[PDB]
Amino acid sequence: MLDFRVETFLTVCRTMNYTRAAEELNITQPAVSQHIAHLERDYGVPLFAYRNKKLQLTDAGALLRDALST
């Protein structure tokens, strides 16, 4: 998995806010979402989801988060 997709995932994982991650990364939100979308399409699992209008880290998102810090 590519360094920059990983960096975007971790930023969104940390901010829990895509537009905020984009500002931090100095890229556009759609760019942030395309990085995430590529990982989700490549691995076939969602990493984030909205539930009742609030961003959530999925079970696979949490596994990715912890694996990256090992």
How far is Cα 66 from Cα 37, in angstroms, rounded to an integer? Answer: 20
Shortest distance, CB of residue 64 to a copy of itself, whole angstroms?
5
Which residues 3-42 are close enough to bind a copy of itself by CB under 8 A? 6
Contact stretch for Cl ion (CB under 5 A) within 1-9, 34-42, 52-60, 61-69: 52-60
Pick 51 or 70: Cβ nearer Cl ion: 51
In Å, how far are 20, 47, 49, 52 from 42, measured between CA atoms?
24, 12, 17, 27
| C-alpha Rg value of the chain to the nearest Å | 11
Q: Does 55 bind Cl ion (CB under 5 A)?
A: yes
